[PDB]
Write a protein that binds this ligand. Structure first.
Ligand code: ZN
Lengths: 89, 344, 62
RNA sequence: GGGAGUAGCAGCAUAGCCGGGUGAGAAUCCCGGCCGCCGUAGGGGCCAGGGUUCCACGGCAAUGUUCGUCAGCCGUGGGUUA
RNA sequence: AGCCGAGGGAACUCGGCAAAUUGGCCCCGUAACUUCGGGAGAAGGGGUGCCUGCGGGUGUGUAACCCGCAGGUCGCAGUGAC
RNA sequence: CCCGAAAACAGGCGGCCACCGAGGGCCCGGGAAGAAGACCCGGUUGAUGGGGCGGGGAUGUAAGCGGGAAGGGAAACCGACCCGUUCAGUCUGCCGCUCCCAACAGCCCGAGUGCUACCGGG
């Protein structure tokens, strides 16, 4: 895993889920893909996605999200479950 | 009445998914030379050569374009010997002897292997079988073999097969097998360049397809294309018999079938990914790598033409069962150019 | 097995590939690809394209 | 009763996402931001016709082609000045 | 419900059904026949972008609208989409 | 050549367990397979997906900076566009190398009994 307090950099591939969905649904699906991906790879029970990340996902409309995101992740412990917070790099 | 032939063949029915992805061999050819009658490998790619024509016909003596498929063939491991006697209706297995020292990874395929089974017990069982063969009770001897796909980093699970042996004398066959058990086999020790081969594999999968593609039926008139029946057939049959006939073309599984393809020429056997010309050694792997595959590193066959199957798939090879009288001669043909350029 | 040269881009292409276009007056042209054929017939000028050899020769002409 | 936990809940305007809140319970209710649709009409004004559907507070058994803490639904009180 | 399609170009079909082609503006030029009004946008052919400069009409006007010329330059394509 | 042990004489052989438990399935990372099911490969005794570094490819020479440009202007300057930097820049539903991140944790199904007629030796 990765230890809390640390600032980690992740590249998320959205190319993958492109062409699974129709063009007009690509950005809303990219959001869910980001959440699932970071949960898997940070071993978190919750993910909180920053508004800046959402805005970068939706910059060019619903049809054209970026192919590769670079994101910063910080994990915190509270009450057991791990919580990951995502920002832009 | 207008006459015409029917749409598709009835000789490959039912058109179903293959039972196994490893192909079985139903018939064997008659070869006097006491050798193992086939080999197995993995498909890698296609390219082309230019060469001086050796086959009969006009264009003999001329330079010609020839397409080629490459099959990667690492060495097989001979792990067993099996004996067959004559039953009431047909052949029946009598006895098998397995070798005692097997590779770890063979348990991924054969989950329950013997435990103690020492060299001494092995020699005792081979003696039992030798005496059985000398008695006169035995009609055929065959080899049991497995692939080694860990030498090329493709897999760890092997494929297990049974091959036949050429000739007539059961005792001579058994002596061959006793020599070969517990040792590696290489394709050069079995095949001859310039031979004609038959090739056996499971075809590329396409899933459920309709009758335009599956049977080659005509697309209907543009009025029907606007009525909703463009890619349908017209009718399922006459009033009497008051049932649908099995011969009427319908939709279903297309591809992933067992097929045998006759009379493909072996043109060259290579070594450690290299081929020898008059003077120099050249890598057959093209710039950038074979697509949906990588780099050929062990040993390979050139087979001219096309063969069934996807790229990373198991292919079985045997000598030709149905060849013509006017054959090409069994020597490697004179090659002038081999394509090494990128294939993507 | 000899290597022909492309009439549009000036590079060599391998045996068993490409095309020969024959004019009725007899002039023969060789093309490595559909790209080059199509550009030559629609009228793009290769002396301004830096992926051709005519560019190098015209730079010498500057 | 079987048909059947099936057809239909597509086609003429394909629209949601992130963060926060309420609440027993939130794809479907509220705030902010991003992204979108109409834009000589899907905006503004107003006859006939309808008759309280208008407003505030409180609710969710039924109605709403899904859910619902929402409502032209349910209850309690109000509201039309020449 | 829509987009493209090599080589052929109606061989399809009761029937070119459906689809394709043409398309705005300026200049040139325009058949038979005719109730002399038309036919007629007949047909058919050329041109059209950006930048730099010159000129004209009305007007008091380096206000505003409209009409011509020459040169340079990029692209497969300048009524470049509609 | 294709299908083919439900071929009711419902088969033969080698091996494992049994008379807790061999073995199987779900779950996980994937695709050469795929309407649901099924098939195939891998799971730290590991290169399965991703990242990074390289290779092979597609298009066609980025932004910035500098220098020119038909002409105009008292002049500082304007100017579509051209040349250099620059086979560049952008991209990759292909290959290779490398454990940097994730293939963690588990949850279900599972054969045990004899009667008499025996069969070949106890
Ligand atoms: Zn060329």
């Amino acid at each position: 895993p990765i230890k809390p307090g640390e600032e980690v950099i992740f590249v998320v591939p959205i190319n993958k889920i492109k062409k699974r969905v129709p063009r007009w649904k690509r950005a809303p699906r990219a959001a869910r893909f980001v959440r699932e991906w970071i949960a898997r790879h940070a071993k978190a029970d919750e993910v909180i996605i920053g508004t800046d990340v959402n805005e970068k996902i939706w910059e060019r409309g619903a049809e054209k999200p970026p192919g590769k995101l670079r994101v910063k992740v910080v994990v915190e412990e509270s009450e057991g479950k791990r919580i990951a917070r995502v920002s832009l790099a | 009445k207008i006459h015409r032939p029917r749409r598709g063949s009835l000789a490959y029915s039912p058109r179903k998914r293959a039972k196994s992805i490893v192909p079985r061999i139903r018939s064997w050819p008659k070869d006097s030379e006491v050798r193992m009658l086939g080999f197995a490998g993995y498909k890698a790619g296609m390219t082309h050569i230019l060469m001086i024509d050796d086959s009969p016909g006009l264009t003999k003596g001329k330079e010609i374009f020839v397409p080629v498929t490459i099959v990667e063939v690492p060495p097989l491991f001979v792990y067993g010997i099996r004996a067959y006697k004559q039953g009431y209706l047909g052949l029946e297995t009598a006895t098998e002897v397995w070798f005692h020292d097997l590779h770890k990874n063979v348990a991924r395929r054969i989950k329950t292997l013997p435990k103690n089974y020492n060299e001494e017990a092995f020699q005792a069982k081979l003696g039992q079988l030798e005496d059985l063969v000398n008695d006169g009770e035995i009609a055929d001897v065959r080899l049991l073999v497995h692939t080694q796909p860990w030498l090329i980093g493709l897999k760890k699970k092997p494929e297990v097969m049974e091959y036949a042996i050429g000739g007539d004398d059961v005792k001579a066959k058994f002596d061959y097998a006793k020599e070969k058990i517990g040792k590696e086999l290489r394709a050069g020790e079995v095949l001859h360049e310039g031979e004609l081969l038959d090739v056996i594999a499971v075809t590329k999968g396409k899933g459920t397809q309709g009758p335009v593609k599956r049977w080659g039926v005509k697309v209907q008139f543009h009025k029907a294309q606007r009525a909703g029946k463009g890619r349908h057939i017209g009718n399922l049959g006459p009033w009497h018999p008051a049932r649908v006939m099995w011969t009427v073309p319908q939709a279903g599984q297309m591809g992933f079938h067992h097929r045998t393809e006759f009379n493909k020429r072996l043109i060259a056997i290579g070594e450690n990914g290299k081929l020898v010309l008059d003077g120099n050694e050249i890598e057959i792997t093209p710039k950038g790598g074979f697509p949906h595959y990588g780099i050929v590193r062990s040993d390979f066959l050139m087979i001219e033409g096309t063969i069934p199957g996807s790229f990373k798939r198991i292919i079985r090879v045997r000598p030709a069962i149905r060849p013509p009288k006017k054959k090409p001669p069994v020597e490697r043909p004179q090659i002038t150019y081999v394509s090494r350029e990128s294939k993507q | 097995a000899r290597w022909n040269v492309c009439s549009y881009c000036g590079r060599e292409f391998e045996p068993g590939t490409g095309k020969m276009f024959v004019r009725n007056d007899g002039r023969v042209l060789f093309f490595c690809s559909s790209k080059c054929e199509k550009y030559y017939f629609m009228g793009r000028n290769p002396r301004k394209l830096k992926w051709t050899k005519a560019f190098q020769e015209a730079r010498l002409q500057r």
